[PDB]
Amino acid sequence: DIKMTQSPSSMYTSLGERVTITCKASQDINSFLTWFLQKPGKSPKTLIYRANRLMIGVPSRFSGSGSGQTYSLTISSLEYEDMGIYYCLQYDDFPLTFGAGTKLDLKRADAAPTVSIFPPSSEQLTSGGASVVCFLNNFYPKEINVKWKIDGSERQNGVLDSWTEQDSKDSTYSMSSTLTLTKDEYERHNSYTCEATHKTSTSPIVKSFNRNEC
Amino acid sequence: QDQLQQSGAELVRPGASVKLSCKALGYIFTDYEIHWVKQTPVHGLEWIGGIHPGSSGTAYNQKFKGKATLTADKSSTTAFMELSSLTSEDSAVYYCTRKDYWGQGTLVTVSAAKTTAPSVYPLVPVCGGTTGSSVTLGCLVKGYFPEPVTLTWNSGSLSSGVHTFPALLQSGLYTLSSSVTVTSNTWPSQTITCNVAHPASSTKVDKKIEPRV
Amino acid sequence: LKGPL
């Protein structure tokens, strides 16, 4: 098993910029190496093969060099349609092996999330479940931590986290956190709290309510 | 030089079998190896094995030897991949590749789940009802199967300020949520409705967002 | 693209 070490694993980039992405192999692959790109929910598309051959149809903006162990992909000036994940693939030997991937996003000024908390709905309550929802929306960068506190104590299971992709106009990210409890457990407690940790601040950002109505 | 064309999405029961197909178009089928590749958010991309339709020789990743069978049919220029004894861990996107070209992938979902309509909850702001410039409203669509659900705000009419979060698995069923931010004066003066449709059960739901209390 | 292996 030949190891492929792709770096970096995520990069914050500007449109117009020149980017370089790399793959080191654990043994000489003799330039048998492809470079491919994957866009959200989309089949991979090869860009380069044999280390430097361009693929019919690929802008001349892409270019790849290397030999031996260290291989490289350069994008001379970045375009909006270039955004996705870049992989590398050695096929010198079996088994074929790939790199972890290199995720590109658009850099922007840092923005703190806008937090919203939602008590269960009456229709939910009337069927035995209680979902407490927290929206952390429009923030940057992607790194965020959420903890749930029921009456002052942290609650780990039943929490469900979902991330949107980088937004095409404003470039921010968004996430929803759903805490599922039963109605009996929900009714046995009073103060439900949302806490968000983000680079934009020291102290986490906290949202709460009280079931007896704050 | 042209394409690889893969079979459709597959929903199978644990312990059953699946035969996927990869149709090769516009190149000499007997001159190139077809390789099959698995993708999943936990493992990344992994190589299952390959087949040379000329010689009929195959090479396998040691991890899939005994699980996966690679065959090819010259007369229909189709490569097939058989997967036996399926489990939730075989749930993934399977690709055939020529190393340069890639088919579009088949989604394989291993599950016991039966088709089930979703439950839709209107998500109104916390009592107190903030007094800022805008308000966020939400809608929570819980417990459906299978995966495809479609969600709009006001039948498509409300489109900006919306966020719709990718569905995730909870206790074997799918859960999804959505959020819209509108200015203070909009709601509750004008109604907002969350419209949800689940084609697999043919469920059509319109839930309005009334103020709490 | 390599082919035989």
Side-chain angles (χ1 to χ4, degrees), chain A residues 25 36 46 72 92 115 129 132 153 207:
Chain A
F36 65 89
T46 306
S72 220
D92 187 21
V115 189
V132 187
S153 85
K207 245 60 178 2

Side-chain angles (χ1 to χ4, degrees), chain A residues 8-46:
Chain A
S9 53
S10 100
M11 119 142 90
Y12 330 87
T13 67
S14 265
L15 291 175
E17 158 171 72
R18 156 203 196 71
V19 348
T20 310
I21 292 159
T22 306
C23 282
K24 263 88 140 84
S26 53
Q27 90 218 213
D28 202 296
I29 36 156
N30 292 297
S31 293
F32 298 90
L33 182 135
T34 100
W35 285 95
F36 65 89
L37 160 77
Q38 190 177 222
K39 273 131 104 52
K42 256 164 100 18
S43 54
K45 180 232 245 212
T46 306

Side-chain angles (χ1 to χ4, degrees), chain B residues 120 139 151-154 192-196 205-207 209:
Chain B
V120 181
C139 191
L151 191 286
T152 51
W153 286 96
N154 267 347
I192 282 129
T193 300
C194 143
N195 327 264
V196 167
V205 177
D206 301 285
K207 225 40 117 38
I209 322 273

Side-chain angles (χ1 to χ4, degrees), chain B residues 173-194:
Chain B
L173 288 184
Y174 291 104
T175 288
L176 169 144
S177 64
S178 170
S179 165
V180 301
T181 316
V182 300
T183 75
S184 259
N185 346 302
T186 306
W187 181 89
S189 286
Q190 326 157 20
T191 56
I192 282 129
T193 300
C194 143

Side-chain angles (χ1 to χ4, degrees), chain A residues 2-4 25 27-36 46 48-53 55 71 88-99, chain B residues 32-33 35 37 47 97-102, chain C:
Chain A
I2 280 149
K3 180 162 130 80
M4 311 300 302
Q27 90 218 213
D28 202 296
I29 36 156
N30 292 297
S31 293
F32 298 90
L33 182 135
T34 100
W35 285 95
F36 65 89
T46 306
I48 289 121
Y49 68 89
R50 189 86 81 121
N52 45 49
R53 266 60 140 195
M55 194 69 182
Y71 296 81
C88 83
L89 186 247
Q90 75 67 41
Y91 47 96
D92 187 21
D93 216 1
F94 293 157
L96 307 196
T97 65
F98 305 74
Chain B
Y32 299 91
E33 289 162 6
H35 289 335
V37 171
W47 175 68
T97 192
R98 210 184 69 158
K99 293 186 242 247
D100 54 3
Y101 309 121
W102 286 87
Chain C
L1 329 239
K2 163 189 143 130
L5 244 275

Side-chain angles (χ1 to χ4, degrees), chain A residues 1 34 36 38 42-46 49 55-56 87 89 91 94-99 114 116-124 127 131 133 135-138 158-164 167 174-176 178 180 208-209 213, chain B residues 1 33 35 37 39 45-47 59-61 95 97 99-105 120-127 130 136-140 142 161 163-170 175 177-181 207-208 212-213:
Chain A
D1 303 54
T34 100
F36 65 89
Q38 190 177 222
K42 256 164 100 18
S43 54
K45 180 232 245 212
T46 306
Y49 68 89
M55 194 69 182
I56 184 200
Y87 293 100
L89 186 247
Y91 47 96
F94 293 157
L96 307 196
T97 65
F98 305 74
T114 273
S116 282
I117 199 166
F118 299 85
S121 79
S122 300
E123 354 207 325
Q124 209 198 353
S127 355
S131 296
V133 183
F135 289 131
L136 301 85
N137 90 193
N138 298 111
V159 176
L160 217 104
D161 284 350
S162 214
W163 262 269
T164 52
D167 174 275
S174 277
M175 85 154 315
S176 60
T178 305
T180 290
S208 330
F209 76 106
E213 256 44 284
Chain B
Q1 224 288 134
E33 289 162 6
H35 289 335
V37 171
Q39 176 187 227
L45 273 355
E46 358 155 58
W47 175 68
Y60 282 96
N61 186 324
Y95 292 125
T97 192
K99 293 186 242 247
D100 54 3
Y101 309 121
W102 286 87
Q104 74 285 7
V120 181
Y121 304 117
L123 268 47
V124 188
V126 299
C127 340
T130 327
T136 320
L137 266 56
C139 191
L140 170 76
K142 221 184 161 321
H163 292 95
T164 296
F165 301 81
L168 308 172
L169 264 197
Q170 206 189 33
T175 288
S177 64
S178 170
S179 165
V180 301
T181 316
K207 225 40 117 38
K208 176 189 151 238
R212 283 158 194 278
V213 175

